[PDB]
Amino acid sequence: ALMITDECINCDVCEPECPNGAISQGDETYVIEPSLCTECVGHYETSQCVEVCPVDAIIKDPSHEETEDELRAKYERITGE
Ligand code: SF4
Ligand code: SF4
């Protein structure tokens, strides 16, 4: 999973880009819900929030380090099939 750091400028642009609805506005920055963040695996070749963030505030979350198989498994859980 990714996470949004303290560099977030609360610009809103990443929220509509997430295929899983993992991003929402928090207290002081936007926040990724890790159980919904597949790092876009299953939907896109790369993370869509990272592509749009203007200040590079979105990084790997080391407390939710996931393999590709885990991220694809999470995509399958979220979307069914
Ligand atoms: S990496 Fe993909 S799944 Fe994770 S929060 Fe960003 S847009 Fe959503
Ligand atoms: S795109 Fe980047 S700066 Fe804008 S709300 Fe999302 S994480 Fe924060």
Side-chain angles (χ1 to χ4, degrees):
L2 306 190
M3 57 182 275
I4 292 171
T5 76
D6 62 285
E7 287 182 76
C8 175
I9 61 159
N10 289 287
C11 75
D12 315 317
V13 309
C14 55
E15 193 215 328
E17 298 296 319
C18 179
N20 300 127
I23 297 176
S24 61
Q25 206 357 346
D27 278 4
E28 260 144 20
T29 64
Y30 276 63
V31 304
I32 289 171
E33 170 41 59
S35 59
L36 290 171
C37 179
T38 58
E39 305 181 24
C40 285
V41 174
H43 288 103
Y44 300 94
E45 53 172 35
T46 199
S47 157
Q48 301 296 283
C49 57
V50 167
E51 287 306 294
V52 299
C53 180
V55 292
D56 297 340
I58 309 185
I59 59 174
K60 295 276 198 321
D61 184 345
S63 77
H64 293 104
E65 196 167 331
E66 289 177 282
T67 47
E68 273 271 340
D69 260 353
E70 283 166 347
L71 293 166
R72 184 156 270 288
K74 180 187 296 181
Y75 159 81
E76 294 164 357
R77 290 183 283 103
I78 291 164
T79 62
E81 266 107 57

Coordinates of all heavy atoms in Angstrom, one line a residue:
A1 N 0.8 -1.2 0.0 CA 0.0 0.0 0.0 C 0.9 1.2 0.0 O 2.0 1.2 0.6 CB -1.0 0.1 1.2
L2 N 0.3 2.3 -0.5 CA 1.0 3.6 -0.5 C 0.4 4.4 0.7 O -0.6 4.0 1.3 CB 0.8 4.5 -1.8 CG 1.2 3.7 -3.0 CD1 1.2 4.7 -4.2 CD2 2.5 2.9 -2.9
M3 N 1.1 5.5 1.1 CA 0.6 6.4 2.1 C 0.9 7.9 1.6 O 1.8 8.1 0.7 CB 1.4 6.3 3.4 CG 2.9 6.4 3.3 SD 3.8 6.2 4.8 CE 3.7 7.8 5.5
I4 N 0.1 8.8 2.1 CA 0.2 10.2 1.8 C 1.0 10.8 3.0 O 0.6 10.7 4.2 CB -1.2 10.8 1.6 CG1 -1.8 10.2 0.3 CG2 -1.0 12.3 1.6 CD1 -3.3 10.6 0.2
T5 N 2.0 11.6 2.7 CA 2.8 12.2 3.7 C 2.3 13.6 4.1 O 1.4 14.1 3.5 CB 4.3 12.3 3.3 OG1 4.4 13.4 2.3 CG2 4.9 11.1 2.7
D6 N 3.0 14.2 5.0 CA 2.9 15.5 5.5 C 3.1 16.6 4.4 O 2.8 17.7 4.6 CB 3.9 15.7 6.6 CG 5.4 15.6 6.1 OD1 6.0 14.5 5.9 OD2 6.0 16.7 6.1
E7 N 3.7 16.2 3.3 CA 3.9 17.2 2.2 C 2.6 17.5 1.5 O 2.6 18.4 0.7 CB 5.0 16.6 1.3 CG 6.3 16.8 2.0 CD 7.6 16.4 1.5 OE1 8.2 17.2 0.7 OE2 8.3 15.4 2.0
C8 N 1.6 16.6 1.7 CA 0.3 16.9 1.0 C -0.2 18.3 1.2 O -0.2 18.8 2.3 CB -0.7 15.9 1.6 SG -2.4 16.1 1.0
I9 N -0.7 18.9 0.1 CA -1.2 20.3 0.1 C -2.7 20.3 0.0 O -3.3 21.3 -0.3 CB -0.5 21.2 -1.0 CG1 -0.8 20.6 -2.4 CG2 1.0 21.3 -0.8 CD1 -0.6 21.6 -3.5
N10 N -3.3 19.1 0.2 CA -4.8 19.1 0.4 C -5.5 19.6 -0.9 O -6.4 20.4 -0.8 CB -5.3 19.8 1.6 CG -4.9 19.0 2.8 OD1 -5.5 18.0 3.1 ND2 -4.0 19.5 3.7
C11 N -5.0 19.2 -2.1 CA -5.4 19.8 -3.3 C -6.6 19.0 -3.9 O -7.1 19.5 -4.9 CB -4.2 19.8 -4.3 SG -3.8 18.2 -5.1
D12 N -6.9 17.8 -3.4 CA -8.1 17.0 -3.9 C -7.8 16.2 -5.2 O -8.6 15.4 -5.5 CB -9.3 18.0 -4.1 CG -9.7 19.0 -3.1 OD1 -9.8 18.8 -1.8 OD2 -10.1 20.2 -3.4
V13 N -6.7 16.4 -5.9 CA -6.6 15.8 -7.3 C -6.5 14.4 -7.3 O -6.9 13.7 -8.2 CB -5.7 16.5 -8.3 CG1 -5.9 18.0 -8.3 CG2 -4.3 16.1 -8.0
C14 N -5.9 13.7 -6.3 CA -5.7 12.3 -6.3 C -7.0 11.6 -6.0 O -7.2 10.4 -6.5 CB -4.7 11.9 -5.3 SG -5.1 12.4 -3.6
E15 N -8.0 12.2 -5.3 CA -9.1 11.4 -4.8 C -9.9 10.7 -5.9 O -10.2 9.5 -5.8 CB -9.9 12.2 -3.8 CG -10.8 11.2 -3.1 CD -12.2 11.8 -2.8 OE1 -12.1 13.0 -2.5 OE2 -13.2 11.1 -2.8
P16 N -10.3 11.4 -7.0 CA -11.1 10.8 -8.0 C -10.2 9.8 -8.8 O -10.8 9.1 -9.7 CB -11.5 11.9 -8.9 CG -11.1 13.2 -8.3 CD -10.1 12.9 -7.2
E17 N -8.9 9.8 -8.7 CA -8.1 8.9 -9.5 C -8.0 7.5 -9.0 O -7.6 6.6 -9.7 CB -6.7 9.4 -9.7 CG -6.5 10.7 -10.4 CD -7.0 10.7 -11.8 OE1 -6.8 9.8 -12.5 OE2 -7.6 11.8 -12.1
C18 N -8.5 7.3 -7.7 CA -8.2 6.0 -7.2 C -9.3 5.0 -7.6 O -10.5 5.2 -7.3 CB -8.2 6.1 -5.6 SG -7.9 4.4 -4.9
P19 N -9.0 3.9 -8.2 CA -10.1 3.0 -8.7 C -10.8 2.3 -7.5 O -11.9 1.8 -7.7 CB -9.3 2.0 -9.5 CG -7.9 2.0 -9.0 CD -7.7 3.4 -8.7
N20 N -10.2 2.3 -6.3 CA -10.7 1.5 -5.2 C -11.3 2.5 -4.1 O -11.7 2.0 -3.1 CB -9.6 0.7 -4.6 CG -9.1 -0.4 -5.6 OD1 -7.8 -0.5 -5.8 ND2 -10.0 -1.1 -6.2
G21 N -11.3 3.8 -4.4 CA -11.8 4.7 -3.4 C -11.0 4.7 -2.1 O -11.6 4.9 -1.0
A22 N -9.7 4.4 -2.2 CA -8.9 4.4 -1.0 C -8.5 5.7 -0.4 O -8.0 5.8 0.7 CB -7.6 3.6 -1.4
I23 N -8.7 6.8 -1.2 CA -8.3 8.1 -0.7 C -9.5 8.9 -0.2 O -10.5 9.0 -0.9 CB -7.6 8.8 -1.9 CG1 -6.3 8.0 -2.2 CG2 -7.3 10.3 -1.5 CD1 -5.6 8.6 -3.4
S24 N -9.3 9.6 0.9 CA -10.3 10.5 1.4 C -9.6 11.7 2.1 O -8.4 11.6 2.4 CB -11.3 9.9 2.4 OG -10.6 9.4 3.5
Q25 N -10.3 12.8 2.4 CA -9.8 13.9 3.1 C -9.6 13.6 4.6 O -10.6 13.0 5.1 CB -10.7 15.1 2.9 CG -10.6 16.6 2.9 CD -9.3 17.2 3.3 OE1 -8.4 16.5 3.8 NE2 -9.1 18.5 3.1
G26 N -8.5 13.8 5.2 CA -8.3 13.6 6.6 C -8.1 15.0 7.3 O -8.5 16.0 6.7
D27 N -7.6 14.9 8.6 CA -7.5 15.9 9.5 C -6.7 17.0 9.0 O -7.1 18.2 8.9 CB -6.9 15.4 10.8 CG -7.9 14.7 11.7 OD1 -9.1 14.6 11.2 OD2 -7.6 14.3 12.9
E28 N -5.5 16.6 8.6 CA -4.5 17.6 8.1 C -4.0 17.3 6.7 O -3.4 18.2 6.1 CB -3.4 17.6 9.1 CG -3.6 18.8 10.1 CD -3.1 18.2 11.4 OE1 -2.3 17.2 11.1 OE2 -3.4 18.7 12.5
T29 N -4.1 16.1 6.2 CA -3.8 15.8 4.9 C -4.8 14.8 4.3 O -5.7 14.3 5.1 CB -2.4 15.1 4.7 OG1 -2.5 13.8 5.4 CG2 -1.3 15.9 5.4
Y30 N -4.7 14.5 3.0 CA -5.5 13.3 2.5 C -4.9 12.1 3.1 O -3.7 12.1 3.6 CB -5.5 13.4 1.0 CG -6.6 14.3 0.5 CD1 -6.5 15.6 0.8 CD2 -7.7 13.7 -0.3 CE1 -7.5 16.5 0.3 CE2 -8.7 14.6 -0.7 CZ -8.6 16.0 -0.4 OH -9.6 16.8 -0.8
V31 N -5.7 11.0 3.0 CA -5.3 9.8 3.7 C -5.6 8.6 2.8 O -6.7 8.6 2.2 CB -5.9 9.6 5.0 CG1 -5.7 10.8 5.9 CG2 -7.4 9.5 4.9
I32 N -4.7 7.7 2.7 CA -5.0 6.4 2.0 C -5.4 5.3 3.1 O -4.8 5.2 4.1 CB -3.8 5.9 1.3 CG1 -3.5 6.8 0.1 CG2 -3.9 4.4 0.9 CD1 -2.2 6.5 -0.7
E33 N -6.5 4.6 2.8 CA -7.0 3.5 3.6 C -6.2 2.3 3.1 O -6.5 1.8 2.0 CB -8.5 3.3 3.4 CG -9.0 2.0 4.0 CD -8.4 1.5 5.4 OE1 -8.7 2.4 6.2 OE2 -7.8 0.5 5.9
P34 N -5.3 1.8 3.8 CA -4.4 0.7 3.3 C -5.2 -0.5 2.8 O -4.7 -1.1 1.8 CB -3.4 0.4 4.4 CG -3.7 1.2 5.5 CD -4.9 2.1 5.2
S35 N -6.3 -0.9 3.5 CA -7.0 -2.1 3.0 C -7.6 -1.9 1.6 O -8.0 -2.9 1.0 CB -8.1 -2.4 4.0 OG -9.0 -1.3 4.1
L36 N -7.7 -0.7 1.1 CA -8.2 -0.5 -0.3 C -7.1 -0.2 -1.3 O -7.4 -0.1 -2.5 CB -9.3 0.7 -0.2 CG -10.6 0.3 0.4 CD1 -11.4 1.5 0.6 CD2 -11.3 -0.8 -0.4
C37 N -5.9 0.0 -0.8 CA -4.8 0.4 -1.8 C -4.1 -0.8 -2.2 O -3.3 -1.5 -1.5 CB -3.8 1.4 -1.1 SG -2.5 1.8 -2.3
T38 N -4.3 -1.1 -3.5 CA -3.7 -2.2 -4.3 C -2.4 -1.7 -5.0 O -1.9 -2.4 -5.9 CB -4.7 -2.7 -5.4 OG1 -4.9 -1.5 -6.1 CG2 -5.9 -3.3 -4.7
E39 N -2.0 -0.4 -4.8 CA -1.0 0.2 -5.6 C -1.4 0.2 -7.1 O -0.6 0.2 -8.0 CB 0.4 -0.4 -5.4 CG 0.7 -0.3 -3.9 CD 2.1 -0.8 -3.5 OE1 3.0 -0.8 -4.4 OE2 2.3 -1.2 -2.3
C40 N -2.8 0.2 -7.3 CA -3.4 0.1 -8.6 C -3.3 -1.2 -9.3 O -3.8 -1.3 -10.4 CB -3.1 1.3 -9.5 SG -3.9 2.8 -9.0
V41 N -2.6 -2.2 -8.7 CA -2.5 -3.5 -9.4 C -3.8 -4.0 -9.7 O -4.7 -4.1 -8.8 CB -1.7 -4.4 -8.4 CG1 -1.6 -5.8 -9.0 CG2 -0.2 -3.9 -8.3
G42 N -4.0 -4.5 -10.9 CA -5.3 -5.0 -11.4 C -6.0 -4.0 -12.2 O -6.8 -4.5 -13.1
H43 N -5.8 -2.8 -12.0 CA -6.5 -1.7 -12.8 C -5.5 -1.0 -13.7 O -5.9 -0.8 -14.9 CB -7.1 -0.6 -11.9 CG -8.4 -1.1 -11.2 ND1 -8.4 -1.5 -9.9 CD2 -9.6 -1.2 -11.7 CE1 -9.6 -1.8 -9.6 NE2 -10.4 -1.7 -10.7
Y44 N -4.3 -0.6 -13.2 CA -3.4 0.2 -14.0 C -2.0 -0.3 -13.8 O -1.7 -1.0 -12.8 CB -3.4 1.7 -13.6 CG -4.8 2.3 -13.8 CD1 -5.7 2.3 -12.8 CD2 -5.1 2.8 -15.1 CE1 -7.0 2.9 -13.1 CE2 -6.4 3.3 -15.3 CZ -7.3 3.4 -14.3 OH -8.5 3.9 -14.7
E45 N -1.1 0.0 -14.8 CA 0.3 -0.4 -14.6 C 1.0 0.3 -13.6 O 2.1 -0.2 -13.2 CB 1.0 -0.3 -16.0 CG 0.9 1.2 -16.5 CD 1.7 1.7 -17.6 OE1 1.9 1.0 -18.6 OE2 2.0 2.9 -17.5
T46 N 0.5 1.5 -13.2 CA 1.2 2.2 -12.1 C 0.2 3.0 -11.3 O -0.9 3.1 -11.7 CB 2.2 3.2 -12.8 OG1 3.2 3.5 -11.7 CG2 1.5 4.4 -13.4
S47 N 0.6 3.4 -10.1 CA -0.3 4.1 -9.2 C -0.8 5.4 -9.9 O 0.0 6.3 -10.3 CB 0.5 4.5 -7.9 OG -0.2 5.6 -7.3
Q48 N -2.1 5.5 -9.8 CA -2.7 6.7 -10.5 C -2.6 7.9 -9.6 O -2.5 9.0 -10.2 CB -4.2 6.4 -10.9 CG -4.3 5.2 -11.8 CD -3.6 5.5 -13.1 OE1 -4.2 6.2 -14.0 NE2 -2.4 5.0 -13.4
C49 N -2.7 7.7 -8.3 CA -2.6 9.0 -7.4 C -1.1 9.5 -7.6 O -1.0 10.8 -7.6 CB -2.9 8.6 -6.0 SG -1.9 7.2 -5.3
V50 N -0.1 8.7 -7.6 CA 1.2 9.2 -7.7 C 1.4 10.0 -9.0 O 2.1 11.0 -9.1 CB 2.2 8.0 -7.7 CG1 3.7 8.4 -8.1 CG2 2.3 7.4 -6.3
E51 N 0.7 9.5 -10.1 CA 0.9 10.2 -11.3 C 0.4 11.6 -11.3 O 0.8 12.5 -12.1 CB 0.1 9.4 -12.4 CG 0.9 8.1 -12.7 CD 2.4 8.4 -13.1 OE1 2.5 9.0 -14.2 OE2 3.3 8.0 -12.4
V52 N -0.7 11.9 -10.5 CA -1.3 13.2 -10.5 C -0.8 14.1 -9.3 O -1.0 15.3 -9.4 CB -2.8 13.2 -10.5 CG1 -3.3 12.5 -11.8 CG2 -3.4 12.5 -9.2
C53 N -0.2 13.5 -8.3 CA 0.1 14.4 -7.1 C 1.1 15.5 -7.5 O 2.2 15.2 -8.1 CB 0.7 13.6 -6.0 SG 1.0 14.6 -4.5
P54 N 0.8 16.8 -7.2 CA 1.7 17.8 -7.7 C 3.0 18.0 -6.8 O 3.9 18.7 -7.3 CB 0.8 19.1 -7.5 CG -0.2 18.7 -6.4 CD -0.5 17.3 -6.7
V55 N 3.0 17.4 -5.7 CA 4.1 17.7 -4.7 C 4.7 16.4 -4.3 O 5.5 16.4 -3.3 CB 3.6 18.5 -3.5 CG1 3.2 19.9 -4.0 CG2 2.5 17.8 -2.8
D56 N 4.5 15.3 -4.9 CA 5.2 14.0 -4.7 C 5.1 13.6 -3.2 O 6.0 13.3 -2.5 CB 6.6 14.2 -5.2 CG 6.5 14.3 -6.7 OD1 5.5 14.0 -7.5 OD2 7.6 14.8 -7.2
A57 N 3.8 13.7 -2.7 CA 3.5 13.4 -1.3 C 3.0 11.9 -1.1 O 2.6 11.6 -0.1 CB 2.4 14.3 -0.8
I58 N 3.1 11.1 -2.2 CA 2.6 9.7 -2.1 C 3.7 8.7 -2.3 O 4.3 8.7 -3.3 CB 1.4 9.5 -3.1 CG1 0.4 10.7 -3.0 CG2 0.8 8.2 -2.8 CD1 -0.8 10.5 -3.9
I59 N 3.9 7.9 -1.3 CA 5.1 7.0 -1.3 C 4.7 5.6 -0.8 O 3.6 5.4 -0.2 CB 6.2 7.6 -0.3 CG1 5.6 7.7 1.1 CG2 6.7 8.9 -0.8 CD1 6.8 8.1 2.1
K60 N 5.6 4.6 -0.9 CA 5.3 3.3 -0.3 C 5.2 3.5 1.2 O 5.9 4.2 1.8 CB 6.6 2.4 -0.6 CG 6.8 2.1 -2.1 CD 5.9 0.9 -2.4 CE 6.2 0.2 -3.6 NZ 6.7 1.1 -4.7
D61 N 4.2 2.8 1.7 CA 4.0 2.8 3.2 C 4.8 1.6 3.7 O 4.4 0.4 3.6 CB 2.5 2.6 3.5 CG 2.3 2.6 5.0 OD1 3.2 2.5 5.8 OD2 1.1 2.8 5.4
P62 N 5.9 1.8 4.5 CA 6.7 0.6 4.9 C 5.9 -0.2 6.0 O 6.4 -1.3 6.3 CB 7.9 1.3 5.6 CG 7.7 2.7 5.5 CD 6.5 3.1 4.9
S63 N 4.9 0.3 6.6 CA 4.1 -0.5 7.5 C 3.1 -1.4 6.8 O 2.4 -2.2 7.4 CB 3.5 0.4 8.6 OG 2.4 1.0 8.1
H64 N 2.9 -1.2 5.5 CA 2.1 -2.0 4.7 C 2.8 -2.4 3.4 O 2.3 -2.1 2.3 CB 0.7 -1.3 4.3 CG -0.1 -1.1 5.5 ND1 -0.3 0.1 6.3 CD2 -0.8 -2.1 6.1 CE1 -1.1 -0.3 7.3 NE2 -1.4 -1.5 7.2
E65 N 3.9 -3.1 3.5 CA 4.7 -3.5 2.4 C 4.0 -4.8 1.9 O 3.9 -5.8 2.6 CB 6.1 -3.8 2.8 CG 7.1 -3.9 1.7 CD 8.5 -3.9 2.2 OE1 9.0 -3.4 3.2 OE2 9.2 -4.6 1.3
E66 N 3.7 -4.7 0.6 CA 3.0 -5.9 0.0 C 3.6 -6.3 -1.3 O 4.1 -5.5 -2.0 CB 1.5 -5.4 -0.3 CG 0.8 -5.1 1.1 CD -0.6 -4.6 0.8 OE1 -0.7 -3.4 0.5 OE2 -1.6 -5.4 0.8
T67 N 3.6 -7.7 -1.4 CA 4.1 -8.3 -2.7 C 3.1 -8.0 -3.8 O 1.9 -7.7 -3.6 CB 4.0 -9.8 -2.6 OG1 2.8 -10.5 -2.1 CG2 5.0 -10.3 -1.5
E68 N 3.5 -8.1 -5.1 CA 2.6 -8.1 -6.1 C 1.5 -9.1 -6.0 O 0.3 -8.7 -6.4 CB 3.3 -8.4 -7.5 CG 3.8 -7.1 -8.1 CD 2.7 -6.5 -9.0 OE1 1.9 -7.3 -9.4 OE2 2.8 -5.3 -9.2
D69 N 1.6 -10.3 -5.5 CA 0.6 -11.3 -5.4 C -0.4 -10.8 -4.3 O -1.5 -11.0 -4.5 CB 1.0 -12.7 -4.9 CG 1.2 -13.7 -5.9 OD1 0.9 -13.3 -7.1 OD2 1.8 -14.8 -5.6
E70 N 0.2 -10.2 -3.3 CA -0.7 -9.8 -2.3 C -1.6 -8.7 -2.8 O -2.8 -8.5 -2.5 CB 0.1 -9.3 -1.1 CG 0.6 -10.5 -0.3 CD 1.7 -10.1 0.7 OE1 2.3 -9.0 0.7 OE2 2.1 -10.9 1.5
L71 N -1.0 -7.8 -3.6 CA -1.8 -6.6 -4.1 C -2.8 -7.1 -5.1 O -3.9 -6.6 -5.1 CB -0.8 -5.6 -4.8 CG 0.1 -4.9 -3.7 CD1 1.2 -4.2 -4.5 CD2 -0.7 -4.0 -2.8
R72 N -2.4 -8.1 -6.0 CA -3.4 -8.6 -6.9 C -4.5 -9.3 -6.1 O -5.7 -9.3 -6.5 CB -2.7 -9.6 -7.8 CG -3.7 -10.1 -8.9 CD -2.8 -10.6 -10.0 NE -2.6 -9.5 -10.9 CZ -3.4 -8.8 -11.8 NH1 -4.7 -9.0 -12.1 NH2 -2.7 -7.8 -12.4
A73 N -4.1 -10.1 -5.0 CA -5.2 -10.7 -4.2 C -6.1 -9.7 -3.6 O -7.3 -9.9 -3.6 CB -4.5 -11.6 -3.2
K74 N -5.6 -8.6 -3.2 CA -6.4 -7.6 -2.6 C -7.3 -7.0 -3.7 O -8.5 -6.8 -3.5 CB -5.5 -6.4 -2.1 CG -6.3 -5.3 -1.4 CD -5.5 -4.1 -1.0 CE -4.5 -4.5 0.1 NZ -3.6 -3.4 0.5
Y75 N -6.8 -6.7 -4.9 CA -7.7 -6.3 -6.0 C -8.8 -7.3 -6.2 O -9.9 -6.9 -6.5 CB -6.7 -6.2 -7.3 CG -7.5 -6.2 -8.6 CD1 -8.2 -5.1 -9.1 CD2 -7.6 -7.5 -9.3 CE1 -8.9 -5.2 -10.3 CE2 -8.4 -7.6 -10.4 CZ -9.0 -6.4 -10.9 OH -9.7 -6.5 -12.1
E76 N -8.4 -8.6 -6.2 CA -9.5 -9.6 -6.5 C -10.5 -9.5 -5.4 O -11.8 -9.6 -5.6 CB -8.9 -11.0 -6.6 CG -8.1 -11.1 -7.8 CD -7.2 -12.3 -7.9 OE1 -7.1 -13.1 -6.9 OE2 -6.4 -12.5 -8.9
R77 N -10.1 -9.3 -4.1 CA -11.1 -9.2 -3.0 C -12.0 -8.0 -3.1 O -13.2 -8.1 -2.9 CB -10.4 -9.2 -1.6 CG -9.8 -10.6 -1.3 CD -9.2 -10.6 0.1 NE -7.9 -9.9 0.2 CZ -7.7 -8.7 0.7 NH1 -8.7 -7.9 1.1 NH2 -6.5 -8.2 0.8
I78 N -11.4 -6.9 -3.5 CA -12.2 -5.7 -3.6 C -13.2 -5.8 -4.7 O -14.4 -5.3 -4.6 CB -11.3 -4.5 -3.9 CG1 -10.5 -4.2 -2.6 CG2 -12.0 -3.2 -4.2 CD1 -9.2 -3.3 -2.8
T79 N -12.8 -6.2 -5.9 CA -13.6 -6.2 -7.1 C -14.4 -7.4 -7.4 O -15.3 -7.4 -8.2 CB -12.7 -6.0 -8.4 OG1 -11.8 -7.1 -8.5 CG2 -11.9 -4.7 -8.3
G80 N -14.2 -8.5 -6.7 CA -14.8 -9.8 -6.9 C -14.2 -10.4 -8.1 O -13.1 -10.2 -8.7
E81 N -15.0 -11.3 -8.7 CA -14.6 -12.0 -9.9 C -15.0 -13.5 -9.8 O -16.0 -13.9 -9.0 CB -13.1 -11.9 -10.2 CG -12.8 -10.8 -11.1 CD -12.1 -9.6 -10.4 OE1 -11.1 -9.8 -9.7 OE2 -12.7 -8.5 -10.5
Ligands
SF4_1 S1 -1.9 3.6 -5.6 FE1 -3.8 3.2 -6.7 S2 -5.1 2.0 -5.2 FE2 -3.5 3.0 -4.0 S3 -4.5 4.9 -3.3 FE3 -3.3 5.4 -5.2 S4 -4.8 5.3 -6.8 FE4 -5.7 4.2 -5.0
SF4_2 S1 -2.7 14.8 -5.0 FE1 -1.0 14.9 -3.5 S2 -1.1 17.0 -2.6 FE2 -3.1 16.6 -3.7 S3 -4.5 15.8 -2.0 FE3 -3.5 14.0 -3.1 S4 -1.7 13.5 -1.9 FE4 -2.3 15.6 -1.3

